[PDB]
Symmetry: C6
Subunit: 202 residues, 6 copies
Amino acid sequence: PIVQNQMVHQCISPRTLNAWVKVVEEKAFSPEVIPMFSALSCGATPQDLNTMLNTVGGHQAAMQMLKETINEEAAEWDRLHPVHIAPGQMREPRGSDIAGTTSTLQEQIGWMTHNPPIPVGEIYKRWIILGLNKIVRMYSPTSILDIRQGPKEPFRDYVDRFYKTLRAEQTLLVQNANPDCKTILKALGPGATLEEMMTACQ
Amino acid sequence: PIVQNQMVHQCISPRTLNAWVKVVEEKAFSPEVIPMFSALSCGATPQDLNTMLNTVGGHQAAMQMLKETINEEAAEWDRLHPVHIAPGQMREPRGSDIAGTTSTLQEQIGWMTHNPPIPVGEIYKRWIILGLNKIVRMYSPTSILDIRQGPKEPFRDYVDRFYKTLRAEQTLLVQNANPDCKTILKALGPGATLEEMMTACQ
Amino acid sequence: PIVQNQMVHQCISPRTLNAWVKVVEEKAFSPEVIPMFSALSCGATPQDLNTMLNTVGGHQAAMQMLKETINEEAAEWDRLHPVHIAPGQMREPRGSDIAGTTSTLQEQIGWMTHNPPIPVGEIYKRWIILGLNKIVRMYSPTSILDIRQGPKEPFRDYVDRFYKTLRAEQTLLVQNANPDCKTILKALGPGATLEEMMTACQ
Amino acid sequence: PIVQNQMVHQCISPRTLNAWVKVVEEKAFSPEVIPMFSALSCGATPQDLNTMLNTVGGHQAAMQMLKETINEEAAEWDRLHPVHIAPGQMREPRGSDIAGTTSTLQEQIGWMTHNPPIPVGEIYKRWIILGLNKIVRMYSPTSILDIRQGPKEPFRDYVDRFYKTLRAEQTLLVQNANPDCKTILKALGPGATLEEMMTACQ
Amino acid sequence: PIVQNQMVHQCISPRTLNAWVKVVEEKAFSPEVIPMFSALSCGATPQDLNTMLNTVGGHQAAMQMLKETINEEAAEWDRLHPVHIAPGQMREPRGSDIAGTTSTLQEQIGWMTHNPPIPVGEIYKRWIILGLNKIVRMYSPTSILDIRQGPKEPFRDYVDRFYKTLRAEQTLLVQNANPDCKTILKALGPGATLEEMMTACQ
Amino acid sequence: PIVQNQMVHQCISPRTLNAWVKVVEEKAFSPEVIPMFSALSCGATPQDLNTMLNTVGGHQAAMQMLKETINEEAAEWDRLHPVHIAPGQMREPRGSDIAGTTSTLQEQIGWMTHNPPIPVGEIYKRWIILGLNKIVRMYSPTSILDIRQGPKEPFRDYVDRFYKTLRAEQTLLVQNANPDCKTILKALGPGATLEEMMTACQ
Ligand SMILES: Nc1ncnc2c1ncn2[C@@H]1O[C@H](COP(=O)(O)OP(=O)(O)OP(=O)(O)O)[C@@H](O)[C@H]1O
């Protein structure tokens, strides 16, 4: 990453490398993996972003869809930012320079530490996260329409499932409740908070 | 977080990220999780606060009630602190800027490091903790009225349960004791410390 | 804690938080937990002291006796140190300011880093340790009078039990020995070291 | 490695040493091991590169093929860069100096920290990675021609295998699909993204 | 400990505390525990030395013999170094000040950082190690006279036992060997190295 | 060790201590332990080198052979470097000063940080490694002459054994192959690389 002592390059730590690889193994593409990726890549150069993605051993169908999303975002960058060099001067980054495939570590450090910065790590991280969200939505196993409260399922457990499914995918909470809790909820009237709905069905 | 070398931004550590995620998995919303959250988010920007909350994989009913509490506190902030910008100058934070949804990391660092600081991380952390306490009270399984000493339960074990329940929820200790220890406690008179009550029933 | 770079505030580390919580879970109130608490809270502000105590999930009977001891020590502080403020000036700490309930982190840092320091963390830590020792003595299961060497128990194992019990609670070692080792010990005469007693009964 | 405080030598950390040794034990020469090696050897001197390779306990057939690749690359270096010394002056590195066998740590630090740097660690790391890729291709158990979707294998699982095999080794995805998904894929027409192919066969 | 940034006090780390406690639990008073204690207490003040010893939960017979050795060494210090104070000046340390029982942390830091240092931590560590060696010799289960090679025990395994026992306790290696290896060893003549003895009996 | 902030003494870390002790327990004197020892003792003073060797609990036959090798190397040092002191001046190191038995930590730091350095840690580490290699060769269980490919053993697995044995101990690879792979290898002609031999017998 690039961090403060002036703004300097540091080696990606063995601990960050290991944390990312373990979250992916333990959680696959459950939605919470995305804000973990984002937090573990704080300050990341594009090189570091490629290291984290390249160190994942399975999920190669997912990694391949991610390259497609990366190439689409890169081509849209080249559309808005054509390039045309000057000895000892900085070249403008193209899509593939941002994605880390045709830029060196030194070019990346030079863009990221310029005054003002050309923030190639934050740009690439936005493309990667966009790709990762399409994958989370892909691998979401259930429609929110099939999250229905069981006859003897505690309301809380049902709400946990309902919002878990809705996060992976993205009135109806009440409709999908079981008869008994549904009746209690119809009676609360409009404008009930989730806290009030969950207290009523306890 | 923001910490001292002057006051600088540091990346949230893999170790803090991991600690928070594990305490939540192992303890759910037992009350002791709150002072752990508070301690692990020392110096946190609002961005970091959102990272810790977003990295929790289950308990999405709880996370949703928390957003409601956050939005209520944010709307009360906008009520007391309306906003109306000046080139190169700091804008005043609204509720949603404090909660980290419409403020950038740079705005957050600028508020938090101003002289005097606009402490957006400490403000948001107070809203989050308020939300978390309502959740601890929600998920508290037992009324203190149903904590009663068993016929052969050691007094200490009963007191542990009584104060555990009372912490999750928030004369009667003696009333809820078993006949034998109850008799010993009635005899101590008024003004007995817990230490004396527990010595008597040993 | 407060530590040296001048004397600065640092966030309590995830590793200290975790160490304290694990020693308590694994050892309860065996006496050795006290010097661990003392060592893990080196440099602690009163806020940090409250964090370590608040993060303990069970033993709420013990935590409650501890508050009683804290309030007693605080009331004795107010007896010896009454307070009576001056813009931009430091107020004198009362008992509850020392215990961290009515003082802010900033007041605590200001007392602890003053020339000369008002060492509010070391004062509160002494109250806490006093409370913790009363708890260690409470939860000590056995009188030293019931530590007696078994007919075929190795002398060393018996001495380990004898001093373990005596530490939790706080001529007789010989009296409580088994007939055979007792006879060997009577013969050594007065003025035998523990090393000599233990060599004789090997 | 060599890292920034000026550019200084630091001891390879016990944590890097241990991470490398564990990834090799747990993953052998699955392709993802290569970008892990590259990331764990950030800043590495040739000495450090030899330490990481020498600390691997099995796979000695692989380590021996790696020496062959190293010697070939070293001989090609000597072909393009003959050497011919001046008191207190730097000698030019030969192949075996780059590979760390006839250069000392001090010569290595002197090349790597010169203005401009003679980047002996990055040169040797490129040779090592080249050798490691030939080993990944060697130990790849399956041809992509034998990755065929099973009659009841979910399409995603098949794509994971297909791209896993293709990474170890390096129209046909559709050909190798099962009849039912093959028919759906023929109908999509040309120019389907992987995301669209995978949605269709869900 | 006291370490270099000038010479400053640092908090004993949770990791040192934990390492010491685990080596004692896993190894008791096997001899190798002594050089581990010595290495984990590098820079230790007497306070830190007491923390490491006080955090050990069992072996209280051993801890008590250790106090006896400490008091003997302290009384011998007072015999050679009597004391007789000057405002703002350093007092001379007595035995019990060195052992950490009547000296404060500040006195300890003042002795240890004086020009020239009064090295109270290194003095106390020598007393502790002396005590620890008497304990290692106490708990040594076997005389070297009962280490004899078994009829089918590999010579190496026997030598491992022989030197293990001799380290806990502190011509005969050959005498204690089995008939067959004994005969081979008699034939080597005088002046055989251990390497040659062990090669001969392979 | 001695490391850079100028060149300063640092305490050997609990993590290095623990890593060395675990590699020895898990790997004994498999050859890869040597470059791990060398890497974990980067910057080591002779004191640190003795700490790492003294903290090993078993293998005391091996530790004793190591002392013999150390004493031989030390006597050869005294043969080439006799000594003959000057107030406030540095004495010349003898063999036993280098090995850490008659030199203090301060003498060691003074030799190692002199301009030019008298590198007593690197000298002693070379003696130790020499001793360790004689031990690796001792404990090598098999001659390379008894590494022969089994009738149904994959060629790779056989090559792994062949080079594992050859590393512990230090045309024939082909001779020791099984009939079928032997025939394929005879046909390749002279000048086949290991990669080509291993491809042919796949
Ligand atoms: N949640 C946890 N609970 C218990 N132990 C943990 C946890 N997380 C990490 N550890 C311990 O810490 C190890 C990983 O981190 P480590 O202890 O090596 O810290 P470190 O990197 O040395 O700290 P620093 O970088 O500050 O020196 C693990 O092997 C484990 O023993």
